[PDB]
């Protein structure tokens, strides 16, 4: 199991020690407060009122937690995933990323605390 | 394992099928959008900017997800719990509850989708 912080201003994302293999079942829990600029802060689901202006993941709100598995496209994580199985053709190391517009991570603040575990399968 | 919705306007709380027993390790993942009154909506962590005016759980923000276990007091759940063990002498059925002031649930809206499972020990 992996546990760590994902900083909102980390454009490259946080690499985990988790390698998703075909058939794996995983659970993720994410908590905390972060911002993509404003003085306010949002949780792992991000800001539901902010328009998508070129987010790295169009399937989640700005300020949400998302992930990549290997060289996949971005996948929404939000508050987390419960005993979750990846789509076929997806496999590799899990990198966690704060959802923002590329090149704009500089003024981000806060972070999410995240646990990732592999479940029984 | 249990999966279900916890309505924000349910003052009595949502009873689950989970009975917490001594030594149990559990994981919870909660997601969604709810409100304790305003047109705006907040995730499972609630509204970090709203003052506590007599909430059923003083250890969580207004609009956060909390729980009771048997006859325990309220325990914060927020976005969820990862492989979590209960405090001493805490056991019994798990009931999930939206954190609000007693007698004011009437104007609440939305809900959280919640998964609860027991982990291997
Ligand atoms: O026009 N607004 O209401 C508005 C409010 C907040 C804004 O924050 C902006 O969001 C961008 C992403 O969408 C970038 O994250 C940028 O760093 C940030 O300042 C940008 C515009
Ligand atoms: O003083 N305010 O700014 C203020 C704004 C919104 C408020 O919503 C209020 O919150 C209460 C809990 O603290 C109750 O949930 C009440 O039903 C709700 O209308 C209550 C007060
Ligand atoms: Ca930003
Ligand atoms: Ca209310």
Numbering used by the authors:
A (entry chain B), B (entry chain A): 1 to 121
Paper lines:
In the case of the opportunistic pathogen Pseudomonas aeruginosa, which causes lethal airway infections in cystic fibrosis and immunocompromised patients, the formation of biofilms plays an important role in antibiotic resistance and disease progression. Biofilm formation is mediated in part by the galactose-specific lectin LecA (PA-IL) and the fucose-specific lectin LecB (PA-IIL), as evidenced by studies with deletion mutants and the partial inhibitory effect of simple fucose and galactose derivatives in vitro and in vivo.[5a, 6] Understanding the glycoconjugate–lectin interaction is a key feature in developing potent biofilm inhibitors. Herein we report the first case of P. aeruginosa biofilm inhibition with a multivalent ligand targeting the galactose-specific lectin LecA, using the related β-phenylgalactosyl peptide dendrimer GalAG2. The structures of the lectin–ligand complexes were investigated to gain insight into the molecular basis of glycopeptide dendrimer–lectin interactions.
